[PDB]
Amino acid sequence: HSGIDFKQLNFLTKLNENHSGELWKGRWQGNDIVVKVLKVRDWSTRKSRDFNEECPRLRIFSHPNVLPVLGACQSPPAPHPTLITHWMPYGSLYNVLHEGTNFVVDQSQAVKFALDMARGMAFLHTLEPLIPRHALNSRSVMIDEDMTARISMADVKFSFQSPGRMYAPAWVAPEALQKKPEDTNRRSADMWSFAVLLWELVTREVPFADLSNMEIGMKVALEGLRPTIPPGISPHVSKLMKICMNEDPAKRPKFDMIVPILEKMQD
C-alpha cells in the first residue's frame, strides 16, 4: 500500500491550526473527510519511514466505537505527512460537552458515551502489541451522527511528534506523568483517563480548567492534585469513579470489566 494520493484530496475549508499542524474539512473518493496535516521540524527519511510504518495500525475498521484513519499521505511525495479520517459533524466529546451551544446532552446520553468508550477501549486493549502513544481524553473521542462515541485513531501521537510536550495532562495517570511508557502498565494508565472522563461527564466541567497544563502535570505528579469527587451523585457512580481512579494502577479494573457495569446503568 502506497497510501492515499495527496492530489486526490479536495480541500474544502480550513478548520484549525496550531502547534501540531492544521486541520481541514475536505472530500476524497466520495467521502466527507477531515485532513490532518502534521507540522514537523527537521523532517527526515527516518521519520517519514516511521510515519509510514505507524499509520497502517490506525486503520481499524472492525469496531463500531473505534474511528479508523482512512489512510495517510506519505511525505514524500506529499508536501507534509498527512492523515485522513471521516468527518464527524458533532466533533469531539470535548466539543459536545463543553462547547455545545444548541443542546446539552442528557445523563442517559452521557452513560451511553461512557459505555461506547469502554467498549472501544476494551477492544483496543486486545491488540498485540497495544497501539503506542494513544492517549484517551475528551479531545481524542469523536461523536458520530447518531451520537455514538468513537475512539479517534487520528489522535494518536507519532514517534516524531513532541515526546517531551504533553498538552492534555489532566487526563493522564499520575504514574504516566513521571515514568517512561515502557515502565508503566499502559492498560491501567488508560483506565485512569477513563475515570477522569467519568468525572467530566458527571460535572460537565473541564478538569482543572483554571490551571495551565504545566501547573496540572506538576501538581498531579508531585503534589497529589486530584479531581474533586462531585457532590450529590449516586453511590454507584461514586464507587465506579473511585475504583477506576485507584491510586494503585494494579487495582484499577480492566475495560472489559466495566463494560457490563455500564450496560446495567443504561436506560
Binding site: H19, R41, S162, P163, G164, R165, M166, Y167, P169, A176, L177, Q178, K179, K180, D183, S212, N213, M214, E215, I216, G217, M218, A221
Partner: protein, 124 residues
C-alpha cells in the same frame, strides 16, 4: 545589538534585569518557584524547561529531562532540551552553546531570557 545594551548601557541593563526577573517570576511563581538571581538560577536547565511549558502551554513529562540534575552532563542535556523546545516554538536556534548557560555566562543567560521576553511578552 544585545551586546551594546549589555556592555554600554547599565541604565538600560538594570531596568532590563528588573523586568526579566518580573517576567520569569510571572510564570514560575505558579509552580511556587521564585527567581531572585538571574546569574545562576537557570544554569542547571530545570527552570528553562519549566518556563517553556508555561510559555507554550504544555506539561513536560518528568521522564523527559532531569528534574534534579546530578552532573554537568545532565545540566547540559536539560539546557539542550530547553533550546530544542524553544525551536519547537518558532525561535531560531539560540546563539549561546548550552554549556555557556551551565557555566553561568550572564550575557548568554540574559540574551536567552530576553529572546524569550521579546516573544512571550503578552503571554499571561
Amino acid at each position: 545589538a544585545f551586546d551594546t545594551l549589555f556592555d554600554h548601557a547599565p541604565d538600560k541593563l538594570n531596568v532590563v534585569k528588573k523586568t526579566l526577573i518580573t517576567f520569569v517570576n510571572k510564570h514560575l511563581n505558579k509552580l511556587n518557584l521564585e527567581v531572585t538571581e538571574l546569574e545562576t538560577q537557570f544554569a542547571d536547565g530545570v527552570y528553562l524547561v519549566l518556563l517553556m511549558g508555561l510559555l507554550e502551554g504544555y506539561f513536560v513529562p518528568l521522564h523527559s529531562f532531569f528534574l534534579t540534575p546530578d552532573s554537568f552532563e545532565q545540566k547540559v542535556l536539560n539546557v539542550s532540551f530547553a533550546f530544542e523546545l524553544m525551536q519547537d516554538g518558532g525561535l531560531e536556534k539560540p546563539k549561546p552553546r548550552p554549556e555557556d548557560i551551565v557555566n553561568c555566562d550572564l550575557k548568554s543567560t540574559l540574551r536567552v531570557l530576553y529572546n524569550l521576553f521579546t516573544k512571550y511578552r503578552n503571554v499571561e
